[PDB]
């Protein structure tokens, strides 16, 4: 999906609670589940990518961190 499309999806789920410009891990699990179900198959690398991308260690990722995450978990 295009970054424009990706931004709309990101915003939709981040809006659920907390900072509207951040996605927590549970918000990201719901988003993947309904938006990219195929990315939640087989052994997951979600926690490893999440741990590495949440640089500030606040349990949340920004839009650019989410983009990299979708990119990487895909290959
Ligand atoms: Mg963070």
Swiss-Prot record:
Positions that bind Ca(2+) 2: 54, 56, 58, 60, 65
Any coiled-coil regions, as ranges: none
Record-level Gene Ontology MF annotations: calcium ion binding; calcium-dependent protein binding; vitamin D binding
SUPFAM superfamilies in the cross-refs: EF-hand
Domain EF-hand span(s) in chain numbering: 9-44, 41-75
Modification Phosphoserine occurs at: 38
Chain sites annotated for binding Ca(2+) 1: 22, 27
Keywords for this protein: Acetylation, Calcium, Metal-binding, Phosphoprotein, Repeat, Vitamin D
PROSITE patterns: EF_HAND_1 (PS00018), EF_HAND_2 (PS50222), S100_CABP (PS00303)
GO CC, one annotated term: apical plasma membrane
Record protein name field: Protein S100-G
Native source organism of the sequence: Bos taurus (Bovine)
Lineage: Eukaryota, Metazoa, Chordata, Craniata, Vertebrata
